[PDB]
Each structure stands twice: as structure tokens, then as C-alpha cells.
Design a protein around this ligand. Structure first.
Ligand SMILES: [Ca+2]
Length: 124
């Protein structure tokens, strides 16, 4: 499935550090919580399909073959969230945080806004 390690994720999400006030360790927690670090995760939801590490949906954020009617706010093909380069994923994730907040990923922010030191890559 191509799952990354916590340390790889910590290095790859660098550009999200403190964005919107969300610390890097919290972003790593969000990633593990939503996809378990699987960059190729695709999940069928109630009214949409979610793609990649950040599980971005094809109803509002990206466009895929299933829903050509996507508002495509991130202006990108969803399959672009299934590869190993997290750069476009991150650009779209910032747009999601900006528009709908951390609740896109967390039922409750407390899930990842606590005991943050466990999300820091020790070998860094
Ligand atoms: Ca990508």
C-alpha cells in the first residue's frame, strides 16, 4: 500500500509547520489518524471518495473520474494525491484547513492537540 514511517512523514510535512497555528507534531498525528501514513489510501465515504495521506475528497476538493461535477477547489486531479510527492497534497490541505478547519480530519482536536512529543521523530 506504500505506507511511510513516522520519521519520513515528519520530514515530509515540514512546510505545514505552524500553519494555521497547527504544529508539525500535530500534523503528523493528523496524518496517522486519517490514513495511517498510507499515501495510496482511497476510501469510499457516504457521498464521496477520499484520496491519499490527507484523505482529500472528490466532491469539493479534487476532481476524479467518478465525480466530474467536483467543485475542484484545489484545482487538481485526485490521483495526484496517490503518489509519493506530498507537495500538492500539502497545498490542498492548507486550503482545507483554511476553509473548513481541523474538523475535516479530527472528530475532536484533542485527539492530536495533546501529548505531542510522541509525534516527534527521535532520529532527527
Ligand atoms: Ca502528491
Amino acid at each position: 500500500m506504500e505506507q511511510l514511517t513516522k520519521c519520513e512523514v515528519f520530514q515530509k510535512l515540514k512546510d505545514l509547520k505552524d500553519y494555521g497555528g497547527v504544529s508539525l507534531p500535530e500534523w503528523v498525528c493528523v496524518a496517522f489518524h486519517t490514513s495511517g501514513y498510507d499515501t495510496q489510501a482511497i476510501v469510499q465515504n457516504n457521498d464521496s471518495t477520499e484520496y491519499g495521506l490527507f484523505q482529500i475528497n472528490n466532491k469539493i476538493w479534487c476532481k476524479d473520474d467518478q465525480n466530474p461535477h467536483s467543485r475542484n477547489i484545489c484545482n487538481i486531479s485526485c490521483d495526484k494525491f496517490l503518489d509519493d510527492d506530498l507537495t500538492d497534497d500539502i497545498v490542498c490541505a492548507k486550503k482545507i484547513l483554511d476553509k473548513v478547519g481541523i474538523n475535516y480530519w479530527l472528530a475532536h482536536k484533542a485527539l492530536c492537540s495533546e501529548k505531542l512529543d510522541q509525534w516527534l521523530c527521535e532520529k532527527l
